[PDB]
Structure formats: C-alpha cells, structure tokens
Amino acid sequence: MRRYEVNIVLNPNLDQSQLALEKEIIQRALENYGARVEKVEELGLRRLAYPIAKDPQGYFLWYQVEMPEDRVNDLARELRIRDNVRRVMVVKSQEPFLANA
Amino acid sequence: PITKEEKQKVIQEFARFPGDTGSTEVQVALLTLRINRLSEHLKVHKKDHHSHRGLLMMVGQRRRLLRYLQREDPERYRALIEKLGIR
Amino acid sequence: KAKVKATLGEFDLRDYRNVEVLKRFLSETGKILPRRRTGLSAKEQRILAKTIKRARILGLLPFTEKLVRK
C-alpha cells in the first residue's frame, strides 16, 4: 500500500442535504476500494481561476489515504460518476521539497 | 514492482551461508525472479519494446552465470536448475 | 528588478494548493515566468513547472489571462 492524495472539486451550490449525501457517497466509495484515511482538509468555497462547468467557484476537498496501488484508476472512475463531482485528481504523495531554505 | 520484503525472502532461500548476498546461486535466483516479473508484464503490453530489451540483457546475464557454474561445479548447477525449473 | 525567490520565505515548492505563493510565479498573463525572473535553480524550476500545471487543472491557477495595456 502506497500513500496518495485525493483532490475533489464539486458544485458549490449544494445545501446540507446534498452536500452530506455527495460526501458520504465519497466515503462509501473509499470503503469499497480499501482506503485507510489518514487526515482530511476541507477548504470549500474558493474562487476559481477560470469557469468550470459555467460556475466561477468550486467547493474543494482533500484526502490523504493509504490504499492498494492497483485499484487507484478504478477509484478515480467511481468518483467522476457523480454529476456534482467535477474535478478528481489523485496524486502519489511526495516529500515537501523546500526552496530558499 | 519488487519490494525489499520479497527480495530478502529470495536471498535467504538461496544463500550458500548466512550473510551471502553475491553467490552465483543468489544472482541467478534474483535474475530469474525479475525475469518472471517481466515475462508476465510482456504477456500483456506486447507493444512495450524498450522493456523487451531489458529482458534480453537479463537472460544473457542469467545464462552467463549458469554457463559459469557448469564449468566449475556441475553438481550445484544441477541443484540450482532443478530448484528453479529451467532448461 | 527583484526576483521571486529573492523576496519570499521558506516555502514548499511541491505544494500545488498554495495559490498565494504560486501566483507570484505567474506573469501578468497566466504564463510561467522564465528562470531569469524567478531566480530559481535548474531542479527547482522543473519542480515548480509541474506543480503549477497541477494547480491549473484544479482551477486554481489560470491557463492564460488578458493583458491590460498597449
């Protein structure tokens, strides 16, 4: 199992009924693919640099997990299925390379 | 790939003695394992030709060590080959 | 002129999510600055370029912008 980082940007128009559903859906997809979650950071409403799906903002999520490597591309396929989910980028974790140290 | 967990498991299995990391039996064992990792990677991915080159170099190196074992001590050569199922 | 690394702190070159610092490395347009203007090293600029492109796909850094002059 290697350690990855998940970036999810979804439609920033959801109420709490839909936001809890979309996110507990994301939890259910991680369970079925065996992702032991290590920590979470939620930024939420953030000004985008260009329109995405005709929408000027995006609701941002970030998960850091440890999961089997073979199942990553299928986990990406499972997250983009939701209409409200717009951006899904999964990156293998790396060391914080410092500059001007 | 090939993690150090699987690596030590092979070296300790084919070491002529504790601490041996470079015996001819150990190199051929290690070579043979990476041979099988690649030959199964090349069953699929038949169009990966640059990886196909690395395989031909490992086979040559594996046969180069076996041809050596044959000349010095042919018994350990048979004990090795029978243990790895080659030729 | 000053260079970007000259006037800055100790920052993570691999963090694609820190837009405030990565905005400094873009020009008036969304273009990536040359090494002459960033004051970075060879290995540093190569890492910056990849982390900038990541922030672009996340909608955080612009692919291109509009110049207001001329």
Place this chain on the structure above:
Amino acid sequence: KRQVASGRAYIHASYNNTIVTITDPDGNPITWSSGGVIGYKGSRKGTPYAAQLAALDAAKKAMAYGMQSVDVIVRGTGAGREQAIRALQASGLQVKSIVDDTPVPHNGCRPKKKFR
C-alpha cells in the same frame, strides 16, 4: 434606437484588413465598419489610414446609439492595429481600457504552408 452609452469595441487587425465592431457590455454588437465598408477595395484596406477611417466610421455610428464610454479589445497583429486604437481615443469616445485578447493556440492545429 438602443441608447447603450457604454460598451465594448473589438479591433480585428490582420495584414490584409482591419475591421472594427462596437458592442454593448454583453458582447452583442451595435454597429461596425471595416476597410471595405469605406471606399477602399484592395490592399488599401490593410493600411493604417484605412484602419483609422474604419475605427472612426464605427465610432460615429455608435454616436447615433449614444455611446460615450468604450472598452477596447484588440485581436491580431497587422498594419494599423495601433492606428485604430489612436483613432479611437480621439474619436470623442472616452476610452475606458485597452486589452489585447489575440487568440494564441497551444500548438493544436497544423498551420497552412504559409505559416511554417
């Protein structure tokens, strides 16, 4: 018949012609002119004089709809690309800002033999 009084002005400047469009803040055009709308016919359209007269013709057409404030957008390099802007500031239209939005691809389409 619109009474817009503020809007955008796009300058499409090519080496063969310079053409001006005046729109409202939403992008929909109001009037327009070019090097061919004025008397010029051939290569005389891609000249800075034709670029100047074309800019001034659309400006006076926008005076009919009541334009005062103008935002300027420029696309393309060509003779008279600058002469059109200079004609627009002194056209009576108070020029709000000037932006260059010339579309540059990311190396997506194969150009004609001329451009290689």
Place this chain on the structure above:
RNA sequence: GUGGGAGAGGGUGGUGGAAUUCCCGGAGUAGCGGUGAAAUGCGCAGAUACCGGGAGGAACGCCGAUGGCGAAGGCAGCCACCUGGUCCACCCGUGACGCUGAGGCGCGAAAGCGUGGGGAGCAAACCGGAUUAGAUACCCGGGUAGUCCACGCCCUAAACGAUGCGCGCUAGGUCUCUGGGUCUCCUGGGGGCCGAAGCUAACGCGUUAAGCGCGCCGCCUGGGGAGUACGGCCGCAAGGC
C-alpha cells in the same frame, strides 16, 4: 547486496485548457477573404467581426534550455498503474564469471501496402484563379489518398558525431546537468566550449581523441556504365538485401 538519486525512457488506462472547423441561438449590415497587384472562392438562403451553448478530431503554448532520457529510431499537457535503463555512497558478498561478435533473432523516422474504423486542421494527385513568352511550378482559392487509432506487412535515409564497440594511458581552464562530500572548493558520472603534448593533406581533433596502445567485428581498392543486368533470398505489392 544495501541505501539513496534524476529523467519528454517505454506500455496501458484516464484526464485538462487554449485554438481551428462545423452545428444551434442571440445580436448585427455589405462585404469578407486573399496578393507584388489581383481574380477564381464565399456572401441577401444574412457571411466576415461579437457574445453564449454544443459536437468532433488532432496537437500540447508559457515552463523550454546552447537542457534531460534512450542502443539507435526517437521521446514534450496532466494523473495513475505496469515497467526498462542508468548513476552515486558504503567496501558487504561471489572470485576472471571478461571484451568483441560472421550467422540467427528482435527493434527500426517518414512515406507506402492490407483489413476495419476515424476524419477537425493540413494536404500528393487532381479541379480552379493568376503570373508568364509558356506554367505540366513557386503565389491564391478548393480538394482525395494520407496524416490519427487498432491488428498485420514493408527493413529504406544526410538511419549524421558523414567518427563501430570495450579498455588502459596522456597538461589544464571554463560553462553546465545530476549525485556524494570535511559544501571559497574537493570528488565521481554525462552534456558544451577553448586549448599541452601529439596526430592530420589541410579544415580541424585534442580525458566524450581523429592522440599513444591493445582485442574483435564491419567495410574500402579510379569515374561513367550502376546500386543497373542476371541469379537467389525475402515481400500481397511498391520494392528491399
């Protein structure tokens, strides 16, 4: 072996924005385009220019480099999986296991061929307009095979460093990529430039040798005829050795 390292190395799937083209709608008149000038072309069935939305294919701007990887061909968005090569530090292990390499086998830009897809831009042939003494051309408007994908052929090249590979030896200075280090620097492994000795017909090469040596393979022996004829092998063909 152990522990680290950099990378358009490769294969697979996925994915992002810009741009071109086309469709839909809004808005909007009289031309756009193109050239040294023009004309064919397109435009009142409403184009060009502008805004919004949609579809499709192909290629990845800035970073970008006189850079990096690869055995060569060659490899640039980004993400993940599979994966090859290589380099450094430790001086741990085997104990000459090495170098080259006629055959063989595998790879091999582009173009071309087969079957089935795909088809936006470009574009042989070809259809036009010009130029011209003529235009079977450069310039302009269109445009098919093709360029792209899958599977199988084809085996050529200025396939170039016009320099086969491996090793040892023979002043340095400077620029650089990447490691380690007691980190004005030292020490490795690549990529450039000047230049000792020396070599070379000269231009030039010069610790990346074209120098001094050694091992092995390939190949050369006047031009035209001619990479043609015949024969053979291979190929569906074009044609190749």
